[PDB]
Design a protein around this ligand. Sequence first.
Ligand SMILES: Nc1ncnc2c1ncn2[C@@H]1O[C@H](COP(=O)(O)OP(=O)(O)OP(=O)(O)O)[C@@H](O)[C@H]1O
Ligand SMILES: Nc1ncnc2c1ncn2[C@@H]1O[C@H](COP(=O)(O)OP(=O)(O)OP(=O)(O)O)[C@@H](O)[C@H]1O
Ligand SMILES: Nc1ncnc2c1ncn2[C@@H]1O[C@H](COP(=O)(O)OP(=O)(O)OP(=O)(O)O)[C@@H](O)[C@H]1O
Ligand SMILES: Nc1ncnc2c1ncn2[C@@H]1O[C@H](COP(=O)(O)OP(=O)(O)OP(=O)(O)O)[C@@H](O)[C@H]1O
Ligand SMILES: Nc1ncnc2c1ncn2[C@@H]1O[C@H](COP(=O)(O)OP(=O)(O)OP(=O)(O)O)[C@@H](O)[C@H]1O
Ligand SMILES: Nc1ncnc2c1ncn2[C@@H]1O[C@H](COP(=O)(O)OP(=O)(O)OP(=O)(O)O)[C@@H](O)[C@H]1O
Ligand SMILES: O=P(O)(O)OC[C@H]1O[C@](O)(COP(=O)(O)O)[C@@H](O)[C@@H]1O
Ligand SMILES: O=P(O)(O)OC[C@H]1O[C@](O)(COP(=O)(O)O)[C@@H](O)[C@@H]1O
Ligand SMILES: [Mg+2]
Ligand SMILES: [Mg+2]
Lengths: 761, 761
Amino acid sequence: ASGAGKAIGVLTSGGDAQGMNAAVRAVTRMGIYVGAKVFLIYEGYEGLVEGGENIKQANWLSVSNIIQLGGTIIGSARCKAFTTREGRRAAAYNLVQHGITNLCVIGGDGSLTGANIFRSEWGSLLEELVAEGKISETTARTYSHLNIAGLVGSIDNDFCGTDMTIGTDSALHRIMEVIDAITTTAQSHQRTFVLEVMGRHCGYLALVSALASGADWLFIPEAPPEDGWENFMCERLGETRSRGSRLNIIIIAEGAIDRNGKPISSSYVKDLVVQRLGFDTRVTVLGHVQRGGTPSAFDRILSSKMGMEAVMALLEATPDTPACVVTLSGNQSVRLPLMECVQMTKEVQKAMDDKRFDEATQLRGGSFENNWNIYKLLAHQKPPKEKSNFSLAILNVGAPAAGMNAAVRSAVRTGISHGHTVYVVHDGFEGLAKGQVQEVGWHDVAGWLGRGGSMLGTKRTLPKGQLESIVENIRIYGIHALLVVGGFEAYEGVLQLVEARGRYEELCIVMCVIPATISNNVPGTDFSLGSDTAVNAAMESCDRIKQSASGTKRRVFIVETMGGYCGYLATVTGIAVGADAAYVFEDPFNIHDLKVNVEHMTEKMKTDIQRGLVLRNEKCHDYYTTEFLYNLYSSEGKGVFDCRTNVLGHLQQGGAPTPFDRNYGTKLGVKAMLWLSEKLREVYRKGRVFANAPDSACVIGLKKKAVAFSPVTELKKDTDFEHRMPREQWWLSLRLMLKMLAQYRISMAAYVSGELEHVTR
Amino acid sequence: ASGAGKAIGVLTSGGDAQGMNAAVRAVTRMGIYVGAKVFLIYEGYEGLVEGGENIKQANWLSVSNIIQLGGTIIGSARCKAFTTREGRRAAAYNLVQHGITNLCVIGGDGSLTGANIFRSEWGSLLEELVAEGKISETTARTYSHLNIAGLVGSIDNDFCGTDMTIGTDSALHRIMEVIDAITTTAQSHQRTFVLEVMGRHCGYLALVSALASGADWLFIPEAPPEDGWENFMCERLGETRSRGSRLNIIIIAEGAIDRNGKPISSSYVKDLVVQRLGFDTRVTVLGHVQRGGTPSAFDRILSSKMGMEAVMALLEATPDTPACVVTLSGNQSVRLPLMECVQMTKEVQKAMDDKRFDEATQLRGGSFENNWNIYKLLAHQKPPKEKSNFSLAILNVGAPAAGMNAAVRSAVRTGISHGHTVYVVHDGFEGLAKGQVQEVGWHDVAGWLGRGGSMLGTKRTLPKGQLESIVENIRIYGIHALLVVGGFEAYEGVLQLVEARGRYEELCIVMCVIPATISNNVPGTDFSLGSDTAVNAAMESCDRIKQSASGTKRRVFIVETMGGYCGYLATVTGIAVGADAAYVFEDPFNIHDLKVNVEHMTEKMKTDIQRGLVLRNEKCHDYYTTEFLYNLYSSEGKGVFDCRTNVLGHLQQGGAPTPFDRNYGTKLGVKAMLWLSEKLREVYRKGRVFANAPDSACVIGLKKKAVAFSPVTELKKDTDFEHRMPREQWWLSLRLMLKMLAQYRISMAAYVSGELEHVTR
Ligand SMILES: Nc1ncnc2c1ncn2[C@@H]1O[C@H](COP(=O)(O)OP(=O)(O)OP(=O)(O)O)[C@@H](O)[C@H]1O
Ligand SMILES: Nc1ncnc2c1ncn2[C@@H]1O[C@H](COP(=O)(O)OP(=O)(O)OP(=O)(O)O)[C@@H](O)[C@H]1O
Ligand SMILES: Nc1ncnc2c1ncn2[C@@H]1O[C@H](COP(=O)(O)OP(=O)(O)OP(=O)(O)O)[C@@H](O)[C@H]1O
Ligand SMILES: Nc1ncnc2c1ncn2[C@@H]1O[C@H](COP(=O)(O)OP(=O)(O)OP(=O)(O)O)[C@@H](O)[C@H]1O
Ligand SMILES: Nc1ncnc2c1ncn2[C@@H]1O[C@H](COP(=O)(O)OP(=O)(O)OP(=O)(O)O)[C@@H](O)[C@H]1O
Ligand SMILES: Nc1ncnc2c1ncn2[C@@H]1O[C@H](COP(=O)(O)OP(=O)(O)OP(=O)(O)O)[C@@H](O)[C@H]1O
Ligand SMILES: O=P(O)(O)OC[C@H]1O[C@](O)(COP(=O)(O)O)[C@@H](O)[C@@H]1O
Ligand SMILES: O=P(O)(O)OC[C@H]1O[C@](O)(COP(=O)(O)O)[C@@H](O)[C@@H]1O
Ligand SMILES: [Mg+2]
Ligand SMILES: [Mg+2]
């Protein structure tokens, strides 16, 4: 099973997407965990060409304390030698001199194209190399096959076969930090903010940025503006002013073009707006800022997971299997052949070269086209000449979660677009009982994207107590559908209403649960809306806490995280921050395990790593509290390290939503409203709605691959109501990666890696 | 476990209730099956007193070919010697001479009172016997405890602790055969039929007869008529005439009295009716006819079951446990202490002696009072000044079953009494889809009791195909409840309509399934309405067939019964007729089992018993058909016996309902309507009936002890839809009794006997 006797090469090439260091760390630490020799190739294909000093064998401490660093400690370089066979043969020679039959390439589309051409010629290169006399025929029959596992490390997301790439999320963090500087201020005078992103080839960053910020206008190369857009844009900004909206946002990609090949410059749009509107227009250009900063939490977890799966795919790969790219489509890990992804990239580039240009956007991926349609729909209120008698109420229940507002905004706009009479109820089920029901318009949710917490009130109160009041108000307002955006209490309350359909006719209405909670404890989803924000806030505090010991001082920090009994937040934060241990409820631990972990920490602190960090979920243990672990670690570490405690309380809660959470809540809010409208049409009968099947009350998912609708009655089997969490949680396999990355010898035979899948046309 | 080394005495005393021979046969055969010696005490307590020749040890063939005989082959006698200690001591002596420490007494209330006084004095009698010198002190310390298991064999049902007694059902068969002679004729002129039953002490037979026949008037000693009943009765008969009803039935018990002690004679009621009405009045007095004829099927099964359980209770009885009476309350076997039952009998007799006379009827048992209330309610239409907006439709679905009409009649009257607008739909779900709904009145169900089959049409078509039509007709007619009287198709169709509540608002109505089928294959009940009739017709054909060999030719009959895959009908019929084997689907058999049974038959047929009888369920085996078994038995029995075949087709189907089926369907029809009305009030909300919980659609039961309401959705787990039968059937334990009575050595550790229960006040 183990990959002993074989060596793994890891290199980074292209633009230094932040989170590359997390991928390199995971690749290295998996390769020497399984016994393989790991060789670090510095400067990418450059050091591959020159070789020699640029190829060094890695130890466990070679990738120590790099996970929080952006860029790449390995270094990346543009080399033209790898383009030509003269340098590529030298690269093959230097790999053979170290017995490196396994190569992991972390880079963009050009990097992976070079890796594909390098595999395709590996046999021919070895033949020409032995022919020229630099390697004997023996020692060339071995190493006859080169194994390539690709990792898409780039901010562009231009690699067509893959949905999400390393560094895209963090580039979005940089972009939205800049936009939030503008939008969160008390907007005082009429001004226009024109943001220029570096999406020269791919406009994905421009698109998701526009969606996350609610941009008034978007210039992306995939969909250039129609002729006469000059007037159309200026009029849009004009009515925006007339509304009283004091700030317009124009997101213009670097690759912005018109229907011809002529590029549209940010300076042109600036001067255009200034001339016709007179708004204070200034162009903000990020430039290098997008590649900068720390990697986001998402980037660290996903880079670590993909780097691990890249190594594992590189050991189980026989001479026959092709070069693969380890990526995630949705939440599911998958391997795609490198050749097909390169071919699709070439097809989209040719299409974008005025071949099938209007039909190139679909080949970019369904996510791009769907994102652009959602953006345009939510941007400007088109007239819904269609009307329907249906009327729906949007609830916010439970704790506040970052991204509830984004979900409610999208739900309101999409429902108005379908002609529904959208109500919003303040304080969730309490207001539904008390009749705090307010008909909502398009502009009533204006600017709700970036606001954290909940504009609508949240209450944890379940509907069972005031069930008579709830059905009374449903009858009064004629609420045909109920959109409940919230945590476990949202799901549990919808479950109580569905169970109470037996008693009350008025509860025979279509219900939908959007899981939105910090704990990520809602059954029927992988990511509750706002768990990403909490994880990012948690790691930032943990990185700060870890940064506080300096120089010589050897100190361990016990950090207590929230999340109730659900350990998700603790474990992922421990992965993102390189925590030594993340004690959670789902992995019960006794004093024997504690002494093991403490002695492990002590031995580690005698090495050159000096800042240990262990996370404690708040409800992992009844007796082994944070004070208990403080006392244990400080006593046993006496004379080796000091121990300190920090309970991250509500520092993980009130933050503004991360860009992932905004886009996520935006999209599933749209999808929830699409599903609500489809189910209401499917269920309208005899002049009324009568939703009484269990599939008419569902939790909107994202369960493995795509968005799902799991009926609440079906989820009740797999729900631990006492602990308020699901019985089977997808993330428990990540404990194995955490423990592996902290030198804990854990037989991870229970970990399942994504299998090969062909590209979806 | 086995009762080896001990002897059992069996005696019969009192009036020879038919079915006593079945009890004696089961007692004897179980006693020598478990290794105990069985002693037959002829003439009851008489032969107990004289003893000697009157006490003979039994072999298996001593009780051979008696199960179909009424009376008692042991013989019964009134003896005054057992009243006095002079004869009772002689009885104790004669029991000790044979080592009979175990006594089974089959008799009425006086018989069991004598048995109680005999146990209570058994120690004193033995002491006085050893004192007088007829038994040594040794041989008296052994036998110091006498074990008494009582069996209530009488037509009176006067024993208060017990609900049903041996011979009551068959006495009712005789009574209703006489009444059906009158009612089934084309009633030509105005005549009054005054039936006098021998219920001198107990009026249970008079009561159940009146209920089964729909008597116009009832004179029972438990509830004497009020003063001035002369006028009240004559007026009732007068309006009966004015209706056009041409026949009046007056059931007068022998013990009929007025509010004083003065008895009311049948001749007086005759002359009274003649004088005031002039109807052709003739008094029919059954006399000895009630005790006559064959025992009914019910009597044979229940006598065999109770005789077996009496023996088993007689072996597991230690010196401390008291004398018990083995009886069935409902369908559940139970043992009641003899002392408490005797005490209750004395209390009711004292109460009936003008002490608590108006409150004596409740101490008689809840079944008596409920039966009398149901009788009076259904007899005469009282004005329902109460009204309710509810309306209900009565369906007959599946095959016709004897007793559907009785259920429909009671449902109609009871629903009209509660003010509901009762509808009847012809052809079940077909007519409900086709709108064959007909509002029904009180007199539209007049005389439906004794009519076999279904007066409403029956169809097997499930409602799923025409579901849009069914909901349309429910909406048009405003049906708020749905009473479905029928077999497995009835249950399955109600299950489909409940499952379709998710789709159709109009199906959110209260539903009730009355199981009515020959096969007894409906889950949620022990006795489908009309299974008793089919069993009785099946045994009567089998008895005829077994009698056709005429005591000289050695012949086996392969008799094929109906019942689908459900073997209930075959097995109980085999018990009733003493069939050698009852092949059924639920007990899969191969050729090895067939050779075992065939060799067993050949050995049996070489002995004194010359008429063999094997039953085959129509769908018990795919290949071993009736013809197969015929060929097998006739070939292997060559030179020993001949084989014949008889497929009882629809002979088991079209009969009039037995008296059990009429009373049963009458009572559960009332109870179904009570439950419907209670559930409709429980579920009426906001100006409409909205029944959507699963407990609003139930199968009326009689599952173990009393009537139950099992929700159809809960029963779906234990329902084998492919074979159209329940997965766990209560009657599989009766196979062991069949096989034991046929000399098959079967380890019946799986049989469970009723435990001790105190009387229910
Ligand atoms: N067709 C190719 N053949 C061989 N090598 C290639 C090919 N394309 C790119 N490379 C090599 O990969 C290196 C980096 O590729 P590239 O310029 O496209 O950056 P990238 O990976 O796409 O990252 P980013 O999009 O963010 O800028 C190049 O310097 C070149 O050495
Ligand atoms: N928020 C926006 N950002 C960028 N372009 C936009 C936006 N809204 C509209 N457009 C562009 O303006 C053009 C016409 O806009 P409009 O929606 O009013 O007509 P349309 O027929 O419905 O176009 P379409 O449905 O294909 O998007 C579209 O081609 C679209 O590309
Ligand atoms: N983080 C924030 N907190 C509080 N208020 C905010 C925040 N961001 C924007 N706002 C307010 O929301 C108001 C609405 O204007 P805003 O620019 O935000 O949205 P919009 O462009 O007009 O419509 P849309 O949301 O659909 O894009 C702004 O005037 C601003 O005061
Ligand atoms: N109190 C008693 N003590 C002793 N023996 C009794 C007592 N009562 C009845 N017996 C005995 O039981 C015998 C039959 O009892 P009984 O006359 O009451 O008939 P039965 O069992 O009640 O049947 P049925 O009611 O149908 O007529 C009597 O002949 C008598 O020998
Ligand atoms: N079918 C019947 N057979 C015998 N007696 C009857 C019948 N119907 C009524 N009676 C008797 O006539 C008496 C009065 O009858 P009625 O029902 O009209 O008044 P009641 O107040 O309702 O009496 P109850 O409710 O106690 O039965 C009752 O005591 C009852 O015993
Ligand atoms: N076995 C039968 N088959 C067919 N018709 C029957 C049968 N028995 C009775 N009937 C008919 O039912 C008609 C109704 O009168 P019936 O005596 O039977 O009942 P009722 O006394 O008038 O009312 P209720 O049923 O409530 O006691 C009779 O005229 C008779 O023709
Ligand atoms: O109950 P949820 O849905 O998991 O809400 C998450 C928040 O609730 C908590 O239990 C604490 O909430 P409170 O501070 O209000 O008491 C934490 O898990 C977290 O801060
Ligand atoms: O299907 P059910 O409910 O068991 O009906 C009982 C009757 O149906 C049968 O299957 C035969 O009916 P048919 O003669 O009409 O075909 C027998 O079991 C029995 O005579
Ligand atoms: Mg690129
Ligand atoms: Mg008696």
